[PDB]
Amino acid sequence: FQGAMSSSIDISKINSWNKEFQSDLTHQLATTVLKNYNADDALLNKTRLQKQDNRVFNTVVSGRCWLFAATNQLRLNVLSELNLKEFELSQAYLFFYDKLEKANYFLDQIVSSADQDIDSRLVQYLLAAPTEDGGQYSMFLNLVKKYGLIPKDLYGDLPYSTTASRKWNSLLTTKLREFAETLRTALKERSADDSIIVTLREQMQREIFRLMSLFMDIPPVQPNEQFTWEYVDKDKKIHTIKSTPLEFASKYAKLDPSTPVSLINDPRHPYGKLIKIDRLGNVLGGDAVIYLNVDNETLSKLVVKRLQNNKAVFFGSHTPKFMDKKTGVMDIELWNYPAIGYNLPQQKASRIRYHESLMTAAMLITGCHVDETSKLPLRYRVENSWGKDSGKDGLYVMTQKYFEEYCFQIVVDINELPKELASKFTSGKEEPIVLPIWDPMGALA
Amino acid sequence: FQGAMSSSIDISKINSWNKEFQSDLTHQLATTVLKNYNADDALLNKTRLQKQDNRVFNTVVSGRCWLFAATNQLRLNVLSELNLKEFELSQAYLFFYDKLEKANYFLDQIVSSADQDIDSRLVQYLLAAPTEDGGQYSMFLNLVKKYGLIPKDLYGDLPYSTTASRKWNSLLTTKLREFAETLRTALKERSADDSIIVTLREQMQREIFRLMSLFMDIPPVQPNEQFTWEYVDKDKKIHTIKSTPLEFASKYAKLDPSTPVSLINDPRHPYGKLIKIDRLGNVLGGDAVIYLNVDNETLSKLVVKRLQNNKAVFFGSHTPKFMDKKTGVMDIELWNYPAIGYNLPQQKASRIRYHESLMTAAMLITGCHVDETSKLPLRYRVENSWGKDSGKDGLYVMTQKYFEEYCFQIVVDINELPKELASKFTSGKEEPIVLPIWDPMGALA
Amino acid sequence: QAYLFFYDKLEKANYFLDQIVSSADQDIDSRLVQYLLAAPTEDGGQYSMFLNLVKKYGLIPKDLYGDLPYSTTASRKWNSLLTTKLREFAETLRTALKERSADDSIIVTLREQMQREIFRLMSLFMDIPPVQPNEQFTWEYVDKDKKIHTIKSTPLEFASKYAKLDPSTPVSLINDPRHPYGKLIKIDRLGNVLGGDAVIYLN
């Protein structure tokens, strides 16, 4: 009894506390202002903004954020290779196959977890959001290795659902939840390899494809089928390229799928270890989401090194934590929360464990400023798919502390790594730390 | 030298003070918020608003603010007398003649001050804004005594300039400034009664009228000329009234111009004295702006008494000081300026002398709440011409302290006064305190 | 409605601290602890959570406590700020519970400091209501005929004498075909006021 009483909200206590707080001048001002405006709007610190909103970067390179971020370098490679003024790869092309493959992958996840109760943690998680739009770099390579890439000119963002996919996803998900029950019900009486189950699964793939084809057309050419693409170079001369999507991704966009690797700063785990997310994927049998865990000093140096190689860096962060979209500044001290006594001592590893921080989006680091001493990076230039309308004409500036605290993953080429880190990936000796499918270091918008 | 140095802004001093202020938590919060939002928006105190925004009034009555306020009672009288559902008097009618008479009055003010230098304080003041839209209750009676009143149905707010008079006023004023020079130049060689001056003045009246007639039509009937007005009573029956504007103001609108008197709380001066504003007027030879100075206890009692007689009270205040248009609350403590250490100890008389407070507008008190004890008024219900769009569906609530501090004038009927106050007006023994034409207790919008 | 909304949030934040202490024996990544950490101060409720509040706090006219504050109509930011703090507090509690018993004076003190910080933060976004549940308020109003009246009552008396709520009469029925009809169904742990009634339905 005494404990439950002490654990209860006591009306005398809260009214006594209220009297004490009302006697403090800062509190009086704070409650007046914060009953009038959104706290971020009220506390944005223009004195701090004035100093941090610095767009000089001494180290720079010459729509589903994850697809824009993963494809931008390849878009630039073509632009370069064909001497074009402007050029875009088709993000819709990858989006269509990503959804189809994920829906298909879900059927396989349901069959492989059919031994678990319907209310088990994994089966419920699988049923929660099987066809969402997010991905990861390995999920992007899985798609490009099977489907290749094509110019946006041949398959654009025309359909309603390419820019407002919520309804389409909900309709496909409702059907997938129906199918999971049909599969699980059929698996009680049979083995998965039973011809009846195999037939059921094919009919489901067919229904998924039929439904998807109502909202988007299947791309115009198969991966090994040639397309013809007519274009104008920066000088106004016309050309015609005949290529297949797979040849295009290699010959013109110069993607070598064997070079990219992901590094992450996940302080919940030992540095130097590989970390693998169980079950997270899109294409059945494709590669896993795997990261090499490293400290922030290492992560920061690799970003600078990649930038010096003249290549942008795909990174995963907790958007929009401490991100001001109007000014395009990512700074954890941009808002004066300490002035209302609101401080956050929880450290990175614990923020992750305690459901406070996770990866939510992919963006690109396209530049940075290394201190004009023999030194370190102070801030990064960041670009994303939102448009010149967001940020400062589309550009964001991120502080080194933001990168250390609210960013996690970067993608670099294996050749840019020190031999002892590169060997973590090449010498099949490493045993990864395997995390659940629902881990916060997962899919990115 | 030492004095001039001490009187200068010293850079070390201000930067030292800045360091001290930045060490205070309240100041840190305040400068963060106030660089983001308008101070009134940031400091509006919703805790105070919650208590003061009380629309229960136990003492209630059953477009140029000054014309709306002066004419509303008369509008109600007709509504009553003719059993109408709705009815409006023509404010445009009075507005047209007010402007014409003021322009004419200005010519007379210029002739009477022709002995003073062009850069004298009075001549420059006369030239500053001779045809503005504001008035006073005595300026309203001056017009009704000469022109009468008519239904808005016969002369409405149709012309552009009735609702956006700035351009028209500027064009008329530019011409009046030209005319002042022509008159003053002619008066150097002649007496004012010289036939040449008399002729000049008539030509100016003619040009003023011509110009005014371009922006508004002269009313359709003369003051002693009959108009015919067809209308529908609240029961849908039709009637026709034949009356002249002067008869209409008396027979139907029941205005007895000999009953209204103005009282004012102007603590710069002794209470019990009449106060007269020199030269302020509209119709040449019309009555002066005269007030009887009284303390706030007396002023407050008279408002309550008039309300009990079921009549609204025309009053003059410093709009929009401490007035929140969105919630329609007039309360001098509604904004938490003390929370940023902003306090105003200057008292009423000094606010007036020091150019801080003055009468700027006329509105109507239509109700009040007298404390349910044998007591005093706590708040007033206020209405004005801005529309149901302003305030709370058009209604404002004003605190007793606001009335005491930022209101000044009320208009009551002489019969509502105590005999010793009424005698101030009736026994030609009182010598008024005469104030300059530019006094702050003047014209009202 | 704001009156109930304020106390609902305060009580739920408090309830969350108790849920964390009672599940401290489970791993941080367990299904329940992660669920508790997902959205501890959201705006939703249930009829039993409403009776729990009215039985403790009563009801008052909106005239005395309206929807004036920003957060009463756009609560997302306020909830996010309170939740970030609650996730910090869950770790502080769980870390302290490894070395101590829950009834340890150090834990009791920690919990009270957390209640205080939760209340402080809430008071920045909404004022605590103007009167306590058993404290009288004065309410002036106008009836449909334009006559004025003044009622003197407390929030608890108001909910009974004027709003006529008898908290012992309401019951919830549900059609949940996952389960046999005629059975009571209870949702484990779902609540707002610590020790208040459970969410129970008759199928």
Judge contact between C37 and C87, C-beta under 8 A.
yes
- Which residue is listed with tokens 């920690």? C110
Closest residue to A9, CB basis, from C103, C115, C120: C115
- From residue B258, alpha-carbon distances to A418, B144, B389 in Å are 102, 12, 36
Counting every residue written for chain C, the total comes to 203
Which of B29, B41, B50, B59 is the mutation pick for testing C, counting most C CBs within 10 A?
B50
Is A31 among the domain residues? no
Q: How far is A293 from A432, CA to CA, in rounded Å? A: 10
SS3 A366: strand
Experimental method: X-ray
CA dihedral B119, B125, B127, B130 (to 10 degrees): -170
φ, ψ dihedrals at B101, nearest 5°: -65, -40
What CATH number corresponds to the domain at position B336?
A: 3.90.70.10
Judge contact between B44 and A36, C-beta under 8 A.
yes
Strands (E), A79-177: none
Angle (nearest 5°) at CA B89 between B88 and B92: 115
Residue B324: which of B256, B243, B382, B238 has the closest Cα?
Answer: B382
Could you please report the per-residue DSSP string of A17-85?
Answer: HHHHHHTSHHHHHHHHHHTTS-HHHHHB-HHHHHHH-----SEE----HHHHHHHHHHHHHHHHHTT-S
> Which chains neighbour B (Cβ–Cβ under 8 Å, 3 or more pairs)?
A, C
Q: How far is A334 from A43, CA to CA, in rounded Å? A: 8
Judge contact between B171 and B160, C-beta under 8 A.
no
Residue C118: which of C159, C145, C75, C85 has the closest Cα?
Answer: C85
Looking at the complex, report in whole angstroms how far the Cα of residue B355 sits from the nearest Cα belonging to chain A.
30
CB atoms within 10 A of CB C77: 17
| C contact residues 104-123, partner A, Cβ 8 Å cutoff | 108, 111-112, 115-116, 119-121, 123
Is A377 among the domain residues? yes
Q: How far is A139 from A144, CA to CA, in rounded Å? A: 9
Burial of A311 (0-12, 13-18, 19+ CB in 10 A): middle
Judge contact between C48 and C197, C-beta under 8 A.
yes
Per-residue burial over A40-65, b = 16 or more CB atoms within 10 Å of its CB, e = otherwise:
ebbbbbeebbeebbeeebebebebbb
Q: How many interface pairs between B and C have CB atoms less than 8 angstroms apart?
A: 18
Q: How far is B31 from A163, CA to CA, in rounded Å? A: 42
Q: How far is B339 from B26, CA to CA, in rounded Å? A: 8
Angle in degrees, 0-180, between the axes of helices A166-189 and A195-215, rounded to the nearest 10: 170
Is B50 among the domain residues? no
Q: Given in angstroms, what resolution was this structure solved at?
A: 1.7
Judge contact between B352 and B360, C-beta under 8 A.
no
Q: How far is B228 from B244, CA to CA, in rounded Å? A: 9
Is A21 among the domain residues? no
Q: How far is A164 from A141, CA to CA, in rounded Å? A: 24
Per-residue burial over A145-164, b = 16 or more CB atoms within 10 Å of its CB, e = otherwise:
bebbbbbbebbebebebbee
Judge contact between A374 and A82, C-beta under 8 A.
no
Q: How far is A208 from A217, CA to CA, in rounded Å? A: 13
φ, ψ dihedrals at B396, nearest 5°: -120, 150
At B72, list the tokens.
Answer: 């509303």
At B259, list the tokens.
Answer: 């009953």
Q: How far is B9 from A394, CA to CA, in rounded Å? A: 43
- From residue B440, alpha-carbon distances to B277, B316, B344 in Å are 10, 11, 20
Range of B169's domain?
Answer: 58-445
Q: How far is B129 from C43, CA to CA, in rounded Å? A: 58
Is A389 among the domain residues? yes
Q: Considering only alpha carbons, which residue of chain B is nearest residue A24?
A: B26
φ, ψ dihedrals at B317, nearest 5°: -140, 175
Q: Does A28 lie at the interface with B, CB-CB under 8 angstroms?
A: yes
Is B183 among the domain residues? yes
CB atoms within 10 A of CB C185: 15
Residue C28: which of A280, A347, A350 has the closest Cα?
Answer: A350
Residue A151: which of A233, A67, A77, A245 has the closest Cα?
Answer: A245
CA dihedral C41, C42, C47, C53 (to 10 degrees): 40
Q: Considering only alpha carbons, which residue of chain B is nearest residue C147?
A: B58
Query: What is the 8-class DSSP label of residue A93?
Result: H
Which of A21, A22, A29 is the mutation pick for testing B, counting most B CBs within 10 A?
A29
Q: How far is CA B322 from the centre of its chain?
A: 17
Counting every residue written for chain B, the total comes to 445
Checking A204-213 for CB contacts under 8 A at 24+ apart, the result is A204/A107, A204/A179, A205/A104, A205/A107, A207/A175, A207/A179, A208/A100, A208/A103, A208/A104, A208/A172, A208/A175, A208/A176, A209/A100, A211/A171, A211/A172, A211/A175, A212/A96, A212/A99, A212/A100, A212/A103, A212/A172
Angle (nearest 5°) at CA A90 between A84 and A95: 160
Q: Does B372 lie at the interface with C, CB-CB under 8 angstroms?
A: yes
Contact across the interface for A6 and C111, Cβ inside 8 Å: yes
Contact across the interface for B35 and A47, Cβ inside 8 Å: yes
Query: What is the 8-class DSSP label of residue A386?
Result: S
Q: How far is B406 from B319, CA to CA, in rounded Å? A: 8
Judge contact between B273 and B433, C-beta under 8 A.
yes
Is A34 among the domain residues? no
Count of domains forming chain A: 1
At A303, list the tokens.
Answer: 């970003």
Closest residue to A43, CB basis, from B32, B46, B339: B32
Q: How far is A383 from A113, CA to CA, in rounded Å? A: 40
Closest residue to B56, CB basis, from C68, C69, C142: C142
Is B53 among the domain residues? no
